[model samples]
Target chain A: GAMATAMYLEHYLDSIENLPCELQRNFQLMRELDQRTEDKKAEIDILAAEYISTVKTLSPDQRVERLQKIQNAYSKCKEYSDDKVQLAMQTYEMVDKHIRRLDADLA
Target chain B: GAMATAMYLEHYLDSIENLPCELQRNFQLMRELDQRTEDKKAEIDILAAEYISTVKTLSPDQRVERLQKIQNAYSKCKEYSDDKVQLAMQTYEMVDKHIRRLDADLA
Candidate 1:
């Protein structure tokens, strides 16, 4: 967990759109994390579309072989997601340094 | 990162006010996580108040002694926030189950 914002320091978060550069950096990482999650999900589904269509166009064995693609698609998305969120968390760690400065100045 | 939302599944989040029971659960944990963050920040500030005032009300040694309290306050807030986010992440893992069903049905 990050340090909580104090009363005077709390004002920094009053407008998320215009936070200091320090916190602003976090917003980018988080938004990037959210966007990437959506991107990977969409990619997996696109892969699945090709996978499901094979059922009508191909022999059973070919369709079964491509099943591996859709399955693998999801696993890869999950891995990508895990990696991205960790980056977001790493950005979160950077926040502690900024907030500590905020606390000190207010004190 | 968790899985991305598919085109067919993207509509589930069209209205955050009304998600299925599964996503509703994540909203609860996430909202809880946000509120608790505010709560902990306020708590640290309140602790800091007593600490700052001590500079005026107490001997130098006494004020110095209580400096430890404000320092610990931030540490505790960080630990608590870390724990809450982990719970939110765990809830995220549950989302994979729901989205998998969404993917299967749409396929």
Candidate 2:
């Protein structure tokens, strides 16, 4: 994700709009990531509700099974989300760094 | 949305900061929500792309289907975004409630 935004930012850095274009693109990417992150958060929320639902419907053993099942799915989503957060953070830092580095050199 | 921020603030307000902590926290949440709300906003971008790509090969029905699909997707996106706009309003209310009350207290 960081690499993706970095690549996108790098692509527009030299185009006609330059900084604003790169910032605008990065802003869009950031906005999209926020959506993905929230959806992922919602999935976790649903899983928590599912855990309660399973508890109500199942025997202890079945409840345990359901928990284990969704826990695995939740873990996978969490890993992807973690990657995305890292990517978002990296992309933000890269944009700031690149903009600063260029600004300094040009100065 | 704003309800979430208000709950967070009511959880923390008696302890004071040099600046308006609730206002600042609410401000941060505003930014975060801005990001999440923006993500749901992308279905339009994809739908438009799909609409354009299919414009040539689509039978009139297929084209209609494609455009309708895009319109449906786009409309869903628009609906989601419209809901988001209302969200900011509710959020303003939730935060404003205890918030404005407290300001009145201080006055």
Candidate 3:
């Protein structure tokens, strides 16, 4: 997790639009990452759509076995996700510290 | 946030490396996104490394002024982060549901 924002200044603007260039890039990347995830999921669903239909044509026993295989796939995907979130959060902490330091200096 | 995993099955394997091709692709993307974020932050820090020394050479008043501008940049960056997190979490929810349903089918 990223560090919590600390302290307050009555005069400070409460908007990110007014932040500096490097800082703005930070937020931009955040948005990029978020959008990319959504796009990736959408892509997966499209792929899954084809896969599900293919599975539907199989015998019941085959379908069950195939789905079991797919289920194993999903578990692997989830593990990948767990690793990602863990790493991303750690990166966020590093950036958060820098941002906080700059914020204090500006204050 | 992504949906929480539901139900339990004693026979299920607990590894992603063994998942199906498409599902494995899903996890691959997750790892890619995480690494990208880390890379971007490292790039930002490298840039900031140069910016700090330049600021140090300025008069106190000018330095304060420049810092304020940088601070504003950070604020905007934070706003980008807020938006990213919001959108990413929503995507995670969608994927989580799909994963959970697939799990149930296999169970």
lDDT of 3 by residue, B1-107 (tens): 11221122222234334444554554354445545555555655655675687865788998777666656656655654454454445444444455566677776
Q: Poorest 10 consecutive residues of model 3 chain A by lDDT?
A: A3-12
Off by over 4 Å in 2: A1-107, B1-40
Q: Write the per-residue lDDT of candidate 1 for residues B1-107, one digit (tens) a residue.
A: 12342343343332333346775665555556657777878978887887776667788888766777767767877876776656655654554455566567666
Q: Give the number of the best model, judged by lDDT.
A: 1
**Backbone clashes in model 2, listed as residue pairs:** B2-B91
Runs off by more than 4 Å, candidate 3? A1-18, A56-107, B1-15, B19-107
Q: Per-residue lDDT for B5-97 in model 2, tens only?
A: 556566566664543655676566657666654664565456555555554554433433333334344445556567657756765776666
The window of 10 residues in a row where model 1 chain B has the poorest summed lDDT is B1-10
Candidate 3: tens digits of C-alpha lDDT, residues A20-89: 5554554456566666556655654554454455643544334333434444445545655665676566
Clash total of candidate 1: 6
Per-residue lDDT for A1-107 in model 2, tens only? 44443433334233323444554564455556556767767877887788876676688898878778777767766775666555555455545555566656655
